[PDB]
Amino acid sequence: KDVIKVLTEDNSLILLLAGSLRNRVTSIRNSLKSIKSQEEKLRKEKSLNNEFIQVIEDIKRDFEESILLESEDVIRIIDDNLLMYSEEGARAFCIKLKGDLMRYKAEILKDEEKNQCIKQAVEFYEDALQRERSFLEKYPSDPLYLATILNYTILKYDLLGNPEGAMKFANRAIQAAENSRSDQFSENTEKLLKILRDNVSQWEQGCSGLLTSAFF
Amino acid sequence: SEGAYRAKLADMVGNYKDVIKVLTESSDFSLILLLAGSLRNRVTSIRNSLKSIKSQEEKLRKEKSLNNEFIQVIEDIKRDFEESILLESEDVIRIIDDNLLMYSEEGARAFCIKLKGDLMRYKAEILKDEEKNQCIKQAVEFYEDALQRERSFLEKYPSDPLYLATILNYTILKYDLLGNPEGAMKFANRAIQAAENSRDSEQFSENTEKLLKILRDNVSQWEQG
């Protein structure tokens, strides 16, 4: 409704559209995360029965299907419908989003498909950051840059299985952000820096933690 | 060992693509139309994620006595996801209605009206009693309107893939929501024979042959049991 009334009345409109596309995938992904925590808790305490266990597996598979469907739709909308009309900023936003989506597909898939997805997410995150560095003034502390960094860091820590490198990556981004400070930072920048520092805090202690990603 | 499975959701993927292509490339003039398509696809995905929650509802309610908290989380997600299908499908419908006329192509107008038929069918799966019956009635209207437009405007309509996709969704409404599986199968049979009596030994489109297969498979499963 918010997005509808705005569109009914193209630059940050594309950004607005792209934020709604992100939300298609992350909304269903968040609900599945809730189901799995609940499942983990349930099964920690209880044996259940074979029928119930199957229903739960069925439900998870329904949610994963839907995440894969949304991800696939959105990647293609970004390539076919958004990218040729985007300015460098929206374009970078969209390339980051494609990395997020390749990452969410890799959380779900196995075998060679999983690996193909993690590789493409590396490719997009790397390409988004390079683009960001070339046009963003004061890129080290820009929130689009820090959110791309943050999300790449979660790819590095988990899917790529390099906790130490992920933490090094985050810490060097925090440092570079702080070295740029003068030249107050935006609310979004401070929010992202706190997530970076909070993730690092957990990782320093030998724990994956929440692996909090960017709120956009 | 379902290589049919990877083929099935690849068809679901092709379907989403086609919704957005049509809404977005059939117009005579948009970001709003992209959003309408994007939302149709979202709503289909929200519905898809709930299918086992729905078809196993009695098993799930049964488990709530001894497994309260888990089943409550499931119930809460279902309520929220269904609120979303209801609210966002009305969003898509409003967008379609405000822009319907800006599709000069007769096929594209029928496409949008079938789509409203689908979205009404979705609301009908969620809603209860009369509110449900009114959505079923509105879905009937939309399907019959789209079918009539397809009959009027489409070349060799009985074997046209949009025509057959419309038959199939109306058949689904008849089978499930209308509680008339026999009426549904006669309806499907009728359209199979009408399509076949179209065409030399001419080849139909791949999407026609896919839809005729689905229609045939469904009648036979009903005929055998």
Short mmCIF file of N, CA and C in Angstrom, two decimals, chain B residues 15-186:
data_model
loop_
_atom_site.label_atom_id
_atom_site.label_comp_id
_atom_site.label_asym_id
_atom_site.label_seq_id
_atom_site.Cartn_x
_atom_site.Cartn_y
_atom_site.Cartn_z
N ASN B 15 5.90 -20.04 -15.30
CA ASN B 15 4.64 -19.35 -15.05
C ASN B 15 4.77 -17.92 -14.48
N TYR B 16 5.61 -17.73 -13.45
CA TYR B 16 5.89 -16.43 -12.87
C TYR B 16 6.42 -15.52 -13.95
N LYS B 17 7.46 -15.97 -14.65
CA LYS B 17 7.98 -15.20 -15.76
C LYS B 17 6.87 -14.72 -16.69
N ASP B 18 6.02 -15.65 -17.12
CA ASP B 18 4.97 -15.31 -18.06
C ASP B 18 3.96 -14.28 -17.55
N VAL B 19 3.60 -14.36 -16.26
CA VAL B 19 2.74 -13.36 -15.63
C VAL B 19 3.36 -11.96 -15.80
N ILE B 20 4.62 -11.82 -15.40
CA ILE B 20 5.29 -10.51 -15.46
C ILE B 20 5.49 -10.02 -16.90
N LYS B 21 5.89 -10.91 -17.81
CA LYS B 21 6.03 -10.56 -19.22
C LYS B 21 4.73 -9.98 -19.78
N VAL B 22 3.64 -10.72 -19.63
CA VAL B 22 2.33 -10.30 -20.11
C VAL B 22 1.89 -8.95 -19.50
N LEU B 23 1.91 -8.85 -18.17
CA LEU B 23 1.43 -7.62 -17.51
C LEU B 23 2.21 -6.36 -17.91
N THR B 24 3.43 -6.59 -18.37
CA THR B 24 4.46 -5.58 -18.43
C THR B 24 4.81 -5.27 -19.91
N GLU B 25 4.65 -6.25 -20.78
CA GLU B 25 4.96 -6.09 -22.21
C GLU B 25 3.72 -6.06 -23.10
N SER B 26 2.55 -6.39 -22.55
CA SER B 26 1.32 -6.37 -23.35
C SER B 26 0.61 -5.01 -23.34
N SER B 27 0.98 -4.15 -22.39
CA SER B 27 0.42 -2.80 -22.29
C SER B 27 0.76 -1.96 -23.52
N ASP B 28 -0.02 -0.90 -23.74
CA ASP B 28 0.23 0.01 -24.85
C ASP B 28 1.16 1.18 -24.48
N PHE B 29 1.49 1.29 -23.19
CA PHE B 29 2.21 2.45 -22.66
C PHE B 29 3.61 2.13 -22.13
N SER B 30 4.97 -0.78 -17.24
CA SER B 30 5.00 0.27 -16.22
C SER B 30 5.45 -0.34 -14.91
N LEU B 31 5.95 0.50 -13.99
CA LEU B 31 6.36 0.00 -12.68
C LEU B 31 5.19 -0.50 -11.83
N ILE B 32 4.02 0.10 -12.01
CA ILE B 32 2.85 -0.35 -11.26
C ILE B 32 2.39 -1.76 -11.72
N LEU B 33 2.56 -2.02 -13.01
CA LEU B 33 2.12 -3.24 -13.64
C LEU B 33 3.08 -4.36 -13.32
N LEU B 34 4.37 -4.01 -13.22
CA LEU B 34 5.42 -4.88 -12.70
C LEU B 34 5.13 -5.27 -11.25
N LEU B 35 4.74 -4.30 -10.44
CA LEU B 35 4.37 -4.55 -9.06
C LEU B 35 3.15 -5.48 -8.98
N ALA B 36 2.13 -5.23 -9.81
CA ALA B 36 0.94 -6.08 -9.84
C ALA B 36 1.32 -7.55 -10.11
N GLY B 37 2.17 -7.77 -11.11
CA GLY B 37 2.71 -9.09 -11.44
C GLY B 37 3.54 -9.66 -10.31
N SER B 38 4.47 -8.86 -9.81
CA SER B 38 5.29 -9.26 -8.68
C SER B 38 4.43 -9.69 -7.48
N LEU B 39 3.33 -8.99 -7.24
CA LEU B 39 2.45 -9.30 -6.12
C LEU B 39 1.59 -10.56 -6.35
N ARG B 40 1.21 -10.79 -7.60
CA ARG B 40 0.47 -12.00 -8.00
C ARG B 40 1.35 -13.21 -7.68
N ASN B 41 2.63 -13.07 -8.00
CA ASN B 41 3.61 -14.15 -7.88
C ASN B 41 3.90 -14.38 -6.41
N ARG B 42 4.15 -13.31 -5.67
CA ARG B 42 4.25 -13.40 -4.22
C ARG B 42 3.09 -14.15 -3.55
N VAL B 43 1.87 -13.78 -3.91
CA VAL B 43 0.63 -14.35 -3.33
C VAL B 43 0.50 -15.86 -3.65
N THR B 44 0.91 -16.24 -4.85
CA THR B 44 1.03 -17.64 -5.25
C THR B 44 2.09 -18.35 -4.40
N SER B 45 3.22 -17.69 -4.16
CA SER B 45 4.24 -18.28 -3.29
C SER B 45 3.78 -18.37 -1.84
N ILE B 46 3.05 -17.37 -1.33
CA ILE B 46 2.52 -17.43 0.05
C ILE B 46 1.55 -18.62 0.15
N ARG B 47 0.67 -18.75 -0.85
CA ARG B 47 -0.25 -19.88 -0.90
C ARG B 47 0.48 -21.23 -0.98
N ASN B 48 1.57 -21.31 -1.75
CA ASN B 48 2.31 -22.54 -1.94
C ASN B 48 2.94 -23.03 -0.64
N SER B 49 3.47 -22.10 0.16
CA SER B 49 4.14 -22.43 1.42
C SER B 49 3.19 -23.03 2.46
N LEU B 50 1.90 -22.80 2.27
CA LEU B 50 0.89 -23.24 3.21
C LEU B 50 0.20 -24.54 2.85
N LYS B 51 0.57 -25.16 1.73
CA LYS B 51 -0.24 -26.29 1.26
C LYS B 51 -0.28 -27.50 2.22
N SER B 52 0.85 -27.89 2.80
CA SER B 52 0.86 -28.96 3.81
C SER B 52 0.21 -28.54 5.12
N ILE B 53 0.34 -27.27 5.48
CA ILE B 53 -0.33 -26.75 6.67
C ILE B 53 -1.85 -26.96 6.51
N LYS B 54 -2.34 -26.68 5.30
CA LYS B 54 -3.76 -26.84 4.95
C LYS B 54 -4.24 -28.29 4.80
N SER B 55 -3.53 -29.07 3.99
CA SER B 55 -3.95 -30.44 3.69
C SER B 55 -3.75 -31.40 4.86
N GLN B 56 -2.97 -30.98 5.86
CA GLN B 56 -2.70 -31.79 7.05
C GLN B 56 -3.24 -31.12 8.30
N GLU B 57 -4.20 -30.22 8.12
CA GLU B 57 -4.77 -29.45 9.23
C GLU B 57 -5.30 -30.29 10.38
N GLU B 58 -6.00 -31.39 10.08
CA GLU B 58 -6.54 -32.25 11.15
C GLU B 58 -5.44 -32.96 11.95
N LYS B 59 -4.41 -33.47 11.27
CA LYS B 59 -3.20 -34.00 11.94
C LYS B 59 -2.50 -32.95 12.82
N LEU B 60 -2.38 -31.74 12.31
CA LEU B 60 -1.77 -30.64 13.05
C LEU B 60 -2.56 -30.19 14.29
N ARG B 61 -3.88 -30.05 14.17
CA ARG B 61 -4.76 -29.75 15.32
C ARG B 61 -4.67 -30.82 16.39
N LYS B 62 -4.58 -32.08 15.95
CA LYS B 62 -4.46 -33.25 16.83
C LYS B 62 -3.21 -33.17 17.71
N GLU B 63 -2.11 -32.71 17.11
CA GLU B 63 -0.81 -32.62 17.75
C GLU B 63 -0.68 -31.47 18.74
N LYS B 64 -1.65 -30.56 18.73
CA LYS B 64 -1.63 -29.35 19.55
C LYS B 64 -1.79 -29.60 21.04
N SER B 65 -2.52 -30.65 21.40
CA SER B 65 -2.73 -31.00 22.81
C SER B 65 -1.40 -31.21 23.51
N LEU B 66 -0.58 -32.08 22.92
CA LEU B 66 0.71 -32.45 23.50
C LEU B 66 1.84 -31.57 23.01
N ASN B 67 1.63 -30.87 21.89
CA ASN B 67 2.67 -30.01 21.33
C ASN B 67 2.16 -28.60 21.07
N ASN B 68 1.66 -27.97 22.13
CA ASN B 68 0.93 -26.72 21.98
C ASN B 68 1.70 -25.61 21.25
N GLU B 69 2.86 -25.28 21.80
CA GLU B 69 3.63 -24.12 21.38
C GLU B 69 4.07 -24.20 19.93
N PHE B 70 4.50 -25.38 19.49
CA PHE B 70 4.91 -25.55 18.10
C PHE B 70 3.72 -25.34 17.12
N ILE B 71 2.58 -25.92 17.46
CA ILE B 71 1.40 -25.89 16.60
C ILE B 71 0.78 -24.47 16.55
N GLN B 72 0.93 -23.74 17.65
CA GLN B 72 0.53 -22.33 17.75
C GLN B 72 1.36 -21.44 16.84
N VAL B 73 2.66 -21.72 16.72
CA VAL B 73 3.52 -20.95 15.82
C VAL B 73 3.06 -21.17 14.39
N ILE B 74 2.74 -22.42 14.08
CA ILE B 74 2.22 -22.83 12.77
C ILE B 74 0.88 -22.13 12.45
N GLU B 75 -0.02 -22.12 13.43
CA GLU B 75 -1.31 -21.43 13.33
C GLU B 75 -1.16 -19.93 13.11
N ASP B 76 -0.22 -19.32 13.84
CA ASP B 76 0.03 -17.87 13.74
C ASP B 76 0.56 -17.46 12.35
N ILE B 77 1.49 -18.26 11.83
CA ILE B 77 2.04 -18.07 10.46
C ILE B 77 0.96 -18.22 9.39
N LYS B 78 0.08 -19.21 9.56
CA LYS B 78 -1.03 -19.46 8.64
C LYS B 78 -2.00 -18.28 8.56
N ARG B 79 -2.39 -17.76 9.72
CA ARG B 79 -3.26 -16.60 9.89
C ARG B 79 -2.66 -15.35 9.23
N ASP B 80 -1.40 -15.08 9.55
CA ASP B 80 -0.65 -13.99 8.96
C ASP B 80 -0.50 -14.12 7.44
N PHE B 81 -0.20 -15.32 6.97
CA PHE B 81 0.07 -15.56 5.55
C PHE B 81 -1.22 -15.43 4.76
N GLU B 82 -2.31 -15.92 5.34
CA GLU B 82 -3.63 -15.79 4.75
C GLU B 82 -4.15 -14.35 4.76
N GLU B 83 -3.90 -13.58 5.84
CA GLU B 83 -4.21 -12.14 5.88
C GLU B 83 -3.52 -11.47 4.67
N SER B 84 -2.24 -11.79 4.45
CA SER B 84 -1.44 -11.30 3.33
C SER B 84 -1.99 -11.66 1.94
N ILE B 85 -2.37 -12.93 1.73
CA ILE B 85 -3.00 -13.30 0.47
C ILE B 85 -4.27 -12.46 0.27
N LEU B 86 -5.11 -12.33 1.31
CA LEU B 86 -6.35 -11.52 1.21
C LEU B 86 -6.12 -10.06 0.85
N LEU B 87 -5.21 -9.41 1.58
CA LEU B 87 -4.95 -7.99 1.43
C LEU B 87 -4.25 -7.69 0.11
N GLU B 88 -3.25 -8.49 -0.23
CA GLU B 88 -2.43 -8.23 -1.41
C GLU B 88 -3.10 -8.67 -2.70
N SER B 89 -3.95 -9.68 -2.63
CA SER B 89 -4.73 -10.01 -3.81
C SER B 89 -5.75 -8.88 -4.15
N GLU B 90 -6.32 -8.23 -3.14
CA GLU B 90 -7.17 -7.08 -3.42
C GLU B 90 -6.34 -5.94 -4.05
N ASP B 91 -5.09 -5.76 -3.60
CA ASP B 91 -4.15 -4.80 -4.19
C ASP B 91 -3.96 -5.06 -5.69
N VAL B 92 -3.62 -6.29 -6.06
CA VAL B 92 -3.42 -6.67 -7.47
C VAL B 92 -4.67 -6.38 -8.32
N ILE B 93 -5.83 -6.84 -7.86
CA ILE B 93 -7.13 -6.62 -8.50
C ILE B 93 -7.42 -5.14 -8.80
N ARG B 94 -7.23 -4.28 -7.80
CA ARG B 94 -7.36 -2.85 -8.00
C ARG B 94 -6.42 -2.32 -9.08
N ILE B 95 -5.17 -2.78 -9.10
CA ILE B 95 -4.20 -2.38 -10.13
C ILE B 95 -4.65 -2.86 -11.51
N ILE B 96 -5.08 -4.12 -11.60
CA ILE B 96 -5.59 -4.66 -12.86
C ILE B 96 -6.78 -3.83 -13.36
N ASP B 97 -7.77 -3.58 -12.49
CA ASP B 97 -8.97 -2.84 -12.88
C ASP B 97 -8.72 -1.40 -13.37
N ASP B 98 -7.75 -0.71 -12.74
CA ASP B 98 -7.40 0.66 -13.13
C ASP B 98 -6.65 0.73 -14.47
N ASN B 99 -6.09 -0.39 -14.90
CA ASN B 99 -5.24 -0.45 -16.09
C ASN B 99 -5.73 -1.38 -17.20
N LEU B 100 -6.81 -2.10 -16.92
CA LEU B 100 -7.36 -3.07 -17.85
C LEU B 100 -7.49 -2.51 -19.27
N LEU B 101 -8.05 -1.31 -19.38
CA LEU B 101 -8.35 -0.71 -20.68
C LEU B 101 -7.10 -0.30 -21.47
N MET B 102 -5.99 -0.12 -20.77
CA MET B 102 -4.73 0.26 -21.41
C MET B 102 -4.04 -0.94 -22.07
N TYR B 103 -4.67 -2.12 -21.96
CA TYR B 103 -4.30 -3.27 -22.78
C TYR B 103 -5.23 -3.33 -24.00
N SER B 104 -4.74 -2.92 -25.17
CA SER B 104 -5.61 -2.93 -26.36
C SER B 104 -5.73 -4.35 -26.93
N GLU B 105 -4.77 -5.19 -26.59
CA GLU B 105 -4.75 -6.57 -27.06
C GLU B 105 -5.81 -7.38 -26.31
N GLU B 106 -6.66 -8.06 -27.07
CA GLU B 106 -7.81 -8.78 -26.48
C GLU B 106 -7.40 -9.98 -25.61
N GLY B 107 -6.35 -10.67 -26.04
CA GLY B 107 -5.72 -11.73 -25.26
C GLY B 107 -5.24 -11.27 -23.90
N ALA B 108 -4.56 -10.12 -23.84
CA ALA B 108 -4.05 -9.56 -22.58
C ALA B 108 -5.14 -9.18 -21.58
N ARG B 109 -6.28 -8.70 -22.08
CA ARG B 109 -7.42 -8.37 -21.21
C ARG B 109 -8.01 -9.62 -20.60
N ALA B 110 -8.16 -10.67 -21.41
CA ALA B 110 -8.65 -11.95 -20.91
C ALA B 110 -7.66 -12.51 -19.89
N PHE B 111 -6.36 -12.36 -20.16
CA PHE B 111 -5.32 -12.78 -19.24
C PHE B 111 -5.50 -12.17 -17.84
N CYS B 112 -5.69 -10.85 -17.77
CA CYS B 112 -5.92 -10.15 -16.50
C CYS B 112 -7.20 -10.59 -15.75
N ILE B 113 -8.26 -10.88 -16.50
CA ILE B 113 -9.54 -11.27 -15.93
C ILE B 113 -9.48 -12.72 -15.37
N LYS B 114 -8.80 -13.61 -16.09
CA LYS B 114 -8.53 -14.95 -15.55
C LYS B 114 -7.75 -14.85 -14.22
N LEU B 115 -6.74 -13.97 -14.21
CA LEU B 115 -5.91 -13.69 -13.06
C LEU B 115 -6.73 -13.23 -11.85
N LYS B 116 -7.69 -12.33 -12.08
CA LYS B 116 -8.64 -11.94 -11.04
C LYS B 116 -9.48 -13.14 -10.58
N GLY B 117 -9.84 -14.01 -11.52
CA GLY B 117 -10.50 -15.28 -11.23
C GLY B 117 -9.70 -16.15 -10.29
N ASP B 118 -8.41 -16.34 -10.61
CA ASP B 118 -7.45 -17.03 -9.73
C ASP B 118 -7.36 -16.42 -8.33
N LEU B 119 -7.19 -15.11 -8.26
CA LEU B 119 -7.12 -14.40 -6.97
C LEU B 119 -8.40 -14.48 -6.14
N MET B 120 -9.56 -14.42 -6.79
CA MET B 120 -10.82 -14.70 -6.10
C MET B 120 -10.90 -16.14 -5.53
N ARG B 121 -10.42 -17.10 -6.32
CA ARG B 121 -10.33 -18.52 -5.92
C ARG B 121 -9.45 -18.67 -4.69
N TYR B 122 -8.35 -17.90 -4.65
CA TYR B 122 -7.47 -17.91 -3.48
C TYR B 122 -8.15 -17.39 -2.23
N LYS B 123 -8.95 -16.32 -2.37
CA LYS B 123 -9.63 -15.70 -1.22
C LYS B 123 -10.66 -16.69 -0.69
N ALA B 124 -11.33 -17.35 -1.63
CA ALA B 124 -12.34 -18.38 -1.37
C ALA B 124 -11.80 -19.58 -0.58
N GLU B 125 -10.51 -19.89 -0.73
CA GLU B 125 -9.85 -20.96 0.03
C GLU B 125 -9.59 -20.55 1.48
N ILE B 126 -9.57 -19.24 1.71
CA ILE B 126 -9.29 -18.66 3.01
C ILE B 126 -10.57 -18.30 3.77
N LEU B 127 -11.49 -17.65 3.07
CA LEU B 127 -12.72 -17.12 3.66
C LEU B 127 -13.75 -18.19 4.00
N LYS B 128 -14.74 -17.83 4.82
CA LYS B 128 -15.72 -18.79 5.31
C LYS B 128 -17.15 -18.39 4.91
N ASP B 129 -18.04 -19.39 4.90
CA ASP B 129 -19.49 -19.19 4.75
C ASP B 129 -19.88 -18.39 3.52
N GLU B 130 -20.50 -17.24 3.75
CA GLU B 130 -21.04 -16.45 2.66
C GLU B 130 -19.94 -15.67 1.95
N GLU B 131 -19.02 -15.10 2.73
CA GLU B 131 -17.89 -14.35 2.20
C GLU B 131 -17.10 -15.25 1.23
N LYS B 132 -16.97 -16.53 1.59
CA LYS B 132 -16.41 -17.56 0.71
C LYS B 132 -17.27 -17.75 -0.54
N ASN B 133 -18.57 -17.97 -0.35
CA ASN B 133 -19.49 -18.17 -1.46
C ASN B 133 -19.52 -17.00 -2.44
N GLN B 134 -19.41 -15.78 -1.93
CA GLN B 134 -19.34 -14.59 -2.78
C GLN B 134 -18.06 -14.57 -3.58
N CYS B 135 -16.93 -14.98 -2.99
CA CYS B 135 -15.68 -15.06 -3.74
C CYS B 135 -15.73 -16.15 -4.81
N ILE B 136 -16.38 -17.27 -4.50
CA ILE B 136 -16.54 -18.33 -5.50
C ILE B 136 -17.41 -17.80 -6.65
N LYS B 137 -18.49 -17.11 -6.31
CA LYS B 137 -19.35 -16.50 -7.33
C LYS B 137 -18.59 -15.50 -8.20
N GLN B 138 -17.78 -14.61 -7.60
CA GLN B 138 -16.95 -13.66 -8.36
C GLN B 138 -15.91 -14.35 -9.23
N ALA B 139 -15.36 -15.48 -8.75
CA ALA B 139 -14.40 -16.29 -9.54
C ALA B 139 -15.04 -16.92 -10.77
N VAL B 140 -16.24 -17.49 -10.58
CA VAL B 140 -17.07 -17.98 -11.69
C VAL B 140 -17.25 -16.90 -12.78
N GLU B 141 -17.79 -15.75 -12.40
CA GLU B 141 -17.93 -14.59 -13.30
C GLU B 141 -16.66 -14.33 -14.13
N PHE B 142 -15.51 -14.19 -13.45
CA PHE B 142 -14.23 -13.84 -14.09
C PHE B 142 -13.76 -14.88 -15.08
N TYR B 143 -13.85 -16.16 -14.70
CA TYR B 143 -13.50 -17.27 -15.57
C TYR B 143 -14.39 -17.32 -16.80
N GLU B 144 -15.70 -17.16 -16.61
CA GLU B 144 -16.61 -17.20 -17.74
C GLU B 144 -16.43 -16.01 -18.67
N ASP B 145 -16.10 -14.85 -18.10
CA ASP B 145 -15.84 -13.63 -18.87
C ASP B 145 -14.57 -13.78 -19.71
N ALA B 146 -13.50 -14.23 -19.07
CA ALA B 146 -12.22 -14.52 -19.74
C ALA B 146 -12.38 -15.59 -20.84
N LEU B 147 -13.06 -16.69 -20.52
CA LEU B 147 -13.38 -17.72 -21.53
C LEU B 147 -14.16 -17.19 -22.74
N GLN B 148 -15.19 -16.37 -22.48
CA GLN B 148 -15.97 -15.76 -23.56
C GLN B 148 -15.11 -14.84 -24.44
N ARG B 149 -14.25 -14.05 -23.81
CA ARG B 149 -13.31 -13.20 -24.56
C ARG B 149 -12.32 -14.04 -25.38
N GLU B 150 -11.80 -15.11 -24.79
CA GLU B 150 -10.95 -16.06 -25.53
C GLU B 150 -11.65 -16.71 -26.74
N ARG B 151 -12.90 -17.14 -26.54
CA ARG B 151 -13.75 -17.68 -27.62
C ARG B 151 -13.96 -16.69 -28.78
N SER B 152 -14.16 -15.42 -28.42
CA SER B 152 -14.42 -14.34 -29.38
C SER B 152 -13.19 -13.91 -30.19
N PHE B 153 -12.05 -13.83 -29.50
CA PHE B 153 -10.91 -13.08 -30.03
C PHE B 153 -9.69 -13.90 -30.41
N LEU B 154 -9.60 -15.13 -29.90
CA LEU B 154 -8.42 -15.95 -30.12
C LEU B 154 -8.56 -16.89 -31.29
N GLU B 155 -7.53 -16.86 -32.12
CA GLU B 155 -7.36 -17.75 -33.26
C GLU B 155 -7.28 -19.19 -32.77
N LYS B 156 -8.10 -20.06 -33.36
CA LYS B 156 -8.14 -21.48 -32.99
C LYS B 156 -8.17 -21.62 -31.46
N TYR B 157 -9.19 -21.02 -30.84
CA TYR B 157 -9.29 -20.92 -29.39
C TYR B 157 -9.30 -22.25 -28.64
N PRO B 158 -9.96 -23.31 -29.19
CA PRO B 158 -10.09 -24.52 -28.37
C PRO B 158 -8.75 -25.15 -27.98
N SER B 159 -7.72 -24.95 -28.80
CA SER B 159 -6.37 -25.43 -28.51
C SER B 159 -5.37 -24.31 -28.16
N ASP B 160 -5.88 -23.13 -27.81
CA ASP B 160 -5.03 -22.01 -27.39
C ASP B 160 -4.63 -22.18 -25.92
N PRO B 161 -3.34 -21.97 -25.59
CA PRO B 161 -2.82 -22.23 -24.24
C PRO B 161 -3.38 -21.32 -23.15
N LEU B 162 -3.70 -20.07 -23.49
CA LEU B 162 -4.38 -19.19 -22.56
C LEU B 162 -5.80 -19.69 -22.35
N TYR B 163 -6.48 -20.03 -23.44
CA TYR B 163 -7.81 -20.62 -23.32
C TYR B 163 -7.81 -21.87 -22.43
N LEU B 164 -6.86 -22.77 -22.66
CA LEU B 164 -6.77 -24.02 -21.88
C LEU B 164 -6.34 -23.79 -20.44
N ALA B 165 -5.49 -22.79 -20.20
CA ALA B 165 -5.10 -22.44 -18.83
C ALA B 165 -6.31 -21.94 -18.08
N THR B 166 -7.20 -21.27 -18.80
CA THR B 166 -8.42 -20.74 -18.21
C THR B 166 -9.41 -21.84 -17.88
N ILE B 167 -9.60 -22.77 -18.82
CA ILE B 167 -10.37 -24.00 -18.61
C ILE B 167 -9.89 -24.75 -17.37
N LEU B 168 -8.57 -24.90 -17.24
CA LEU B 168 -7.95 -25.67 -16.16
C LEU B 168 -8.21 -25.07 -14.79
N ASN B 169 -8.04 -23.75 -14.65
CA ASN B 169 -8.30 -23.08 -13.39
C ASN B 169 -9.79 -23.07 -13.00
N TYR B 170 -10.66 -22.93 -13.99
CA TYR B 170 -12.11 -23.03 -13.79
C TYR B 170 -12.48 -24.45 -13.39
N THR B 171 -11.87 -25.44 -14.05
CA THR B 171 -12.01 -26.85 -13.68
C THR B 171 -11.60 -27.08 -12.22
N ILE B 172 -10.50 -26.46 -11.79
CA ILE B 172 -10.03 -26.54 -10.40
C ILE B 172 -11.06 -25.95 -9.41
N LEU B 173 -11.64 -24.80 -9.78
CA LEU B 173 -12.69 -24.16 -8.98
C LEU B 173 -13.90 -25.07 -8.82
N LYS B 174 -14.31 -25.70 -9.93
CA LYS B 174 -15.44 -26.63 -9.94
C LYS B 174 -15.18 -27.87 -9.10
N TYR B 175 -14.00 -28.45 -9.27
CA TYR B 175 -13.61 -29.65 -8.56
C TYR B 175 -13.55 -29.38 -7.06
N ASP B 176 -12.73 -28.43 -6.65
CA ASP B 176 -12.48 -28.22 -5.22
C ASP B 176 -13.59 -27.36 -4.59
N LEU B 177 -13.48 -26.04 -4.75
CA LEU B 177 -14.37 -25.06 -4.10
C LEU B 177 -15.87 -25.26 -4.32
N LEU B 178 -16.26 -25.62 -5.54
CA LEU B 178 -17.67 -25.80 -5.88
C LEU B 178 -18.18 -27.18 -5.47
N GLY B 179 -17.25 -28.06 -5.09
CA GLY B 179 -17.57 -29.41 -4.62
C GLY B 179 -18.29 -30.25 -5.66
N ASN B 180 -17.89 -30.09 -6.93
CA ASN B 180 -18.55 -30.79 -8.04
C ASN B 180 -17.51 -31.48 -8.95
N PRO B 181 -16.88 -32.57 -8.45
CA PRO B 181 -15.77 -33.18 -9.18
C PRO B 181 -16.17 -33.80 -10.52
N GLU B 182 -17.41 -34.29 -10.61
CA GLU B 182 -17.94 -34.89 -11.83
C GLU B 182 -18.22 -33.81 -12.88
N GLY B 183 -18.88 -32.73 -12.45
CA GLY B 183 -19.11 -31.57 -13.31
C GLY B 183 -17.79 -31.02 -13.82
N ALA B 184 -16.79 -31.01 -12.94
CA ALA B 184 -15.42 -30.60 -13.27
C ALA B 184 -14.80 -31.47 -14.37
N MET B 185 -14.93 -32.79 -14.22
CA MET B 185 -14.31 -33.70 -15.17
C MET B 185 -15.01 -33.74 -16.53
N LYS B 186 -16.33 -33.65 -16.54
CA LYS B 186 -17.08 -33.47 -17.79
C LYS B 186 -16.66 -32.18 -18.50
#
